[model samples]
Target chain A: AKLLDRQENGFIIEKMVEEFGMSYLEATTAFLEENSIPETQFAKFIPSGIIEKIQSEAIDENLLRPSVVRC
Target chain B: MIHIQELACVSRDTKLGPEEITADIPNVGEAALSKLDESGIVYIGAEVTGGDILVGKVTPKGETQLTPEEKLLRAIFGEKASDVKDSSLRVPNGVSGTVIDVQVFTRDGVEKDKRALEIEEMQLKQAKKDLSEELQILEAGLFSRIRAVLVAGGVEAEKLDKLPRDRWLELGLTDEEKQNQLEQLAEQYDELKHEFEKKLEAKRRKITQGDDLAPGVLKIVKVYLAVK
Candidate 1:
């Protein structure tokens, strides 16, 4: 959250990846959770291009629709 | 005639079948006849030679016990004395009786069984083909719908199939436009995901008792059901 409050574009994701050595998806999710931002708020700071990537990865990981039936 | 030992069931008065023959012979009693029945001996047309010990062939009421294997065989072949051949449960040695009746029953039962099996096999094959074709159609239809959604959201039609899902927002759209388009896409998949689930549930309900589906058909359905 503090990193995000810095308001630098890509700063939070960079710090997360640096500090936690997490994947883009994990770092983004952690950033969202720590800042108390819902997934819908994803595009506010992140570039739409990066946001789209995150959501697509999230969908594969079932983060987009958690309750959907899995096969 | 050999004097055979009678292994009697004498703990109490044993129940006898309607056609069971009982002789007053010492020690032997009804045990000998019972042994003949247990050994699956056929009596009526049995060829007994001199010095050969005779075992009970059919029940006194003229019933031959059919093994499941024998019954299966009989169902595949018509009932005829000449049709009786070697079976999983062959007639044991040291038991002699008329087998003409037994052979006839065995042959008929197996022929009937085989026809039923053949019909059932055909039905099973048809069902698997039907399921595979339906799943294929559903998969193709779903892919087209996804492509349509992409194209409608400002993706060029020619690049529709080639565009990756992660690069969707890069389709010559402003940030605001991209966000709105993403929301729309999400809602579309939400509805489609649920619809797919419901469709799958409906199809599964069509499967009936005793009809196990082929693994390939099951895999096809499963792969599509994974789409969210």
Candidate 2:
């Protein structure tokens, strides 16, 4: 198998879903765990704008790629 | 322009048509594609890899020398010389995506419901997509509350312990103060976790049992959750 390291810390949800058969939650949990961040600190670590964007996009979700800047 | 070699994660290639269909050649062989076999067409949603068979093709081989009997049969059957070869389509190297769809074509054209089917599939995709977003928003927000409760409790507990443990260890009043806050912290932690669990379960159940969740829209629901 060939491989390359993921460069960004973000929309990795799609990657995890495709590469590891992880559900979105599993990927998100992995993100939190790998960063050693707790759920409570999710906002502190990730940007508030990200959450707002996700919520805004919920009407018809074609999520923006989350590559860096924490979640 | 991204080459097919680079999209290792998000490339969704179309299923290949038979060589006959693609090139308009009579490639029917004994080994593959003589029958327009749809059996081997990769179904939608399957994960595929390079060299995995995407079509079951067999090409034809004409008899090297036709015997009198063969000639007679050929005359009767209008040149039926099928020794078909296997040239089935396969997934190419260095590209990957979940198979999103498969379409069938016949000389007679396609079925009437092609539009209906395609539209429904897109609708299903939309529903699943929406479901995913809703879950993310829901979980992230809910976990925030759980996080708030859990961490807020930690702060109070920490204050009591730190006040007594490092800064000052007054024998009685401080120790008593520590115990009281610690006790309340434990109660909130317990209650918050319990409440979060119940709330999460209810949401999961609602979405899991909801429509496609539209398709394995159910599977999507089952997976859109987790722990700690």
Candidate 3:
């Protein structure tokens, strides 16, 4: 957090202006809401928010679609 | 009739061998001259009947009778051991025949063959490990493709969990690019499947190699029997 800039805005986006600027940040920026790492983070793992996303998708799969019977 | 002994679970010294047990029988030595197979046991064509021994096995007792936790704690509390569970192999109740084959192999080999046998089993152990990996690679299609696509682009492994076609947008490949990527991924899968086939065609050969007749660790055997 020391490396991040504190803005009045609550959600802070930590930009490695040095590292990603040279190569990958544009790719990261293009990824999140419309932005997003390397070895410094465990990019090889499941995201923490995955369960919420999974339930959302499952509910959409269940609710946005349906079935009834002709007895 | 033919039968085999599984040596993995037996207490090594207490377990009497095939020849040693055969000595107890009256006519066995006369009907079957001292013909030991390559594994140093009875030769094929040896006749057998009910109660006639094939493998002379014995597992030491005392360890099993203890309270369950006692054995678990036995690593610290365990003491001197001795005797039965006389698991020796005998010709079964309703069967009788002449032995056809008596082939045997072990993770261990021979009482004393310092050179070739150790080297032979050494090579087999290495090949067994390699064949196991071969089996693993042939079976790894689903997981490998996910990693393949992740690596193919500037994507990381976690990108694999991202779902729906829009998930590609999370990786920087938006809707316009997703269709292009789909065409390319189709090609990637073809190559993955092609490389998969030549490897395990010969190796898929298992009636389930690791399956057990009983269940133990180090040794296994099989015997073929013939009867009119």
Question: What digit string (tens of lDDT, one per residue) describes model 3 on residues B1-228?
Answer: 335422222213332322122112221322322343323245567786655555443344464454322232122212321122344455667777766665333333224223225545565565566666754664465445544555565555564555653353344443456446655655665566565554444443331133333233334344556654
lDDT of 1 by residue, B62-170 (tens): 1155432223222222232112211112233554333233211121112223423454466566666665566566556655654565566566777655666545434
Tell me what TM-score chain B of candidate 2 gets against the true chain B.
Answer: 0.26
TM-score of the second chain in each model? 0.28, 0.26, 0.32
Summarize candidate 2's per-residue lDDT along B1-228 as a digit string, tens digits.
322222111111123212221211222322222222233444455556555544443333345533332332232224332223344455667545455544432222223233334544665566656555655665555444433443453444444434432222222233445456544544654466566556555654443232321211111101010111
lDDT of each: 0.39, 0.38, 0.38
Q: Candidates' DockQ values?
A: 0.00, 0.01, 0.00
TM-score of every model?
0.23, 0.22, 0.26
Candidate 1 DockQ category?
incorrect
Off by over 4 Å in 1: A1-71, B1-112, B154-156, B162-228
| Each prediction's fraction of true contacts recovered | 0.00, 0.00, 0.00
| Candidate no. 3 TM-score | 0.26
User: Where is model 2 more than 4 Å wrong at Cα?
Assistant: A1-71, B1-38, B64-82, B109-228
Q: Candidate 1: what lDDT?
A: 0.39
